[PDB]
Design a protein around this ligand. Structure first.
Ligand SMILES: Cn1c(=O)cc(C2CC2)[nH]c1=O
Ligand SMILES: [Cl-]
Length: 149
């Protein structure tokens, strides 16, 4: 058995949906990310109120790809005044640090049966950018991602 993820009691988990495969590559290379203004505010509030008592996990998926591509942990608050245009499109203001934990394609078929009670019971695979995942469902997703081969 594997009862690791079943044990954590503090932590918050968010879906990250990227349109760009380049930006995923850049995120892995430099351990940084940026969301929309509204998404940045959501992640920043979750990070800051966590006050180091537990992780903020980011579950990454490219829009339309049919799979998740990996897992990262938030590693700083959001810096809103940084160099513009560093991503594939010039639509982003700011930067926060991440640490990629897992880089692996996990098909949506492995995850579509986990549904989010806070998003109308929709499959976790039908989420939008910075959709938050309830911790009990997040533990289930993390275990499937870790166990996929
Ligand atoms: C939806 N989406 C993208 O497609 C690309 C980015 C990059 C700045 C990191 N962020 C984002 O939220
Ligand atoms: Cl929860």
């Amino acid at each position: 058995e594997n009862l690791y993820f079943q044990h954590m009691k503090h932590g918050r988990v968010f879906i990250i949906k990227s349109y760009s495969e380049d930006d995923i590559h850049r995120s892995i290379k430099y351990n940084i990310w940026c969301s929309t203004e509204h998404g940045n505010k959501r992640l920043d509030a979750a990070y800051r109120s966590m006050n180091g008592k537990g992780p903020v996990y980011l579950l990454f998926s490219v829009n339309g790809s049919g799979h998740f591509c990996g897992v990262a942990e938030m590693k700083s608050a959001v810096d809103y005044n940084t160099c513009a245009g560093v991503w594939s499109q010039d639509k982003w203001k700011g930067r926060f640090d991440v640490r990629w934990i897992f880089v692996k394609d996990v098909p949506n078929s492995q995850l579509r049966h986990i549904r989010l009670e806070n998003n109308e019971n929709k499959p976790v695979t039908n989420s939008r950018d910075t959709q938050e995942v309830p911790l009990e469902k997040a533990k289930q997703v993390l275990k499937i991602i870790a166990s996929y081969k």
